Design a protein around this ligand. Sequence first.
Ligand SMILES: Nc1nc2c(ncn2[C@@H]2O[C@H](COP(=O)(O)OP(=O)(O)O)[C@@H](O)[C@H]2O)c(=O)[nH]1
Ligand SMILES: CCOc1ccc(-c2cn(C)nc2-c2cc(OC)c(OC)c(OC)c2)cc1
Ligand SMILES: [Ca+2]
Ligand SMILES: [Mg+2]
Lengths: 424, 67
Amino acid sequence: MREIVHIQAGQCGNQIGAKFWEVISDEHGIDPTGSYHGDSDLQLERINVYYNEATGNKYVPRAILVDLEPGTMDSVRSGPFGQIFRPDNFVFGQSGAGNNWAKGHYTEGAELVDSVLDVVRKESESCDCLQGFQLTHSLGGGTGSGMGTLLISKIREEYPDRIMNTFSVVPSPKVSDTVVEPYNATLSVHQLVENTDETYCIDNEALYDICFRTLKLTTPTYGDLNHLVSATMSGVTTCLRFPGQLNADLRKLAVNMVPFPRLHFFMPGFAPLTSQYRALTVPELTQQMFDAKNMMAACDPRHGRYLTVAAVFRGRMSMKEVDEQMLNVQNKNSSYFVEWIPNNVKTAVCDIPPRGLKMSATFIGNSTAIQELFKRISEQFTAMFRRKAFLHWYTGEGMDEMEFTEAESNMNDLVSEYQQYQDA
Amino acid sequence: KREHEREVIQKAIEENNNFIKMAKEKLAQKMESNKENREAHLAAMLERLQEKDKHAEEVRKNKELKE
Ligand SMILES: Nc1nc2c(ncn2[C@@H]2O[C@H](COP(=O)(O)OP(=O)(O)O)[C@@H](O)[C@H]2O)c(=O)[nH]1
Ligand SMILES: CCOc1ccc(-c2cn(C)nc2-c2cc(OC)c(OC)c(OC)c2)cc1
Ligand SMILES: [Ca+2]
Ligand SMILES: [Mg+2]
């Protein structure tokens, strides 16, 4: 099991996805046209996880670009690393999704979904041993939310035994396109609970506050929000992309991180937070990555308990001092880690650091506090839904009010389920 | 879920079509009811003017038939 197939859905999906590929191509020494111009053999030793090798020794990403309008995917092609993606893997409709789940899932997206899966199959067929799939998308809009969750269901039908990861940008009024986002998010969450093994909850509320408060950016763009995401995305995928001895796959992570199948909603963190000259000591990275300020999902981890943690330190450092520091926060704050899962924090180290920093730390937490994020969207949903506000946009595409009442209830059970183990 | 996906898009077509149908018919009802009403008005106007002619024939005979 080596190969991962990547899909990126809609505006946000394709935007953060582009940056993920820009970031990791740089770490692997792969230039904008697809040729390798690095130095180490360690850059190429697990390049087959995210790249196909082409004629004339070009490296092309195993990446499929999906949208219901040509806007964003045109910008990706014009953008800095656009010439590397296989042009056949640009699959786009024309009419758009209008920030409407129904359009993405049931009508406009239904028309395009088969043509997307053909390319998925095309990239899968030439995988020595396909391990799984990862999707970048948002739950607030139409395409990424609706069509993204449809593709997830189609991919599961056709490849029911592979791993399905998502990097899912959860919405927020602080960084809002449209009032209907909580509807879209809530319909998507119900899908993700069934059809994904891991879902990385990127919350736009959190990314804003990190950009605003802890980076001193007064007026942050989506660009500033996506820097944080593409750094985090490089961080969690480090151990797949590099050697070694203590090397990794998706399924073992999914197994060890997810004690109950519906509870697979992780809370990312990164340290230090960038947009520097003093390198951080190991005790600082450990303090920072566990800080609520560094979390990408706007939840206070003190309001719940960790079921499992996974931590990935990058850089040349004392593995003695990492162990010692990781054992310090566990032994000094043991009330916030469940007692009934022994040794539930796993640490890995990787010698290659990311562009800019001499040593970093990425944090993956399956905390019960993540219920707060779903409670927030569940409140935003009901304020509107209790007056059937804005439903005409969805019922016009064939949707029923029953489907909304279901998706509401499924997510309120998810919050109950997370609350259950926060007390036990 | 696959049969539900088709049930939604079939319903989306059904009501889009139904809106065209009941618009198309409601408009036909009005344009026919109107044309009936407008001609009913102009027929009664002309029938009162045709009744004036028959009275003017009684007046033109009462001159002839009173000599
Ligand atoms: N972090 C981040 N969020 C985004 C970006 N673009 C859109 N969003 C968020 O995603 C939601 C809208 O989804 P969008 O991707 O525009 O719609 P789609 O193209 O139909 O999937 C809103 O909650 C936006 O705040 C982006 O570049 N970065
Ligand atoms: C709560 C314990 O969580 C764990 C324990 C072990 C593993 C694991 C086992 N293998 C063979 N590989 C991993 C692993 C660990 C990671 O964390 C440092 C990974 O980074 C996210 C990883 O990447 C896929 C694999 C996993 C979780
Ligand atoms: Ca169409
Ligand atoms: Mg948008």
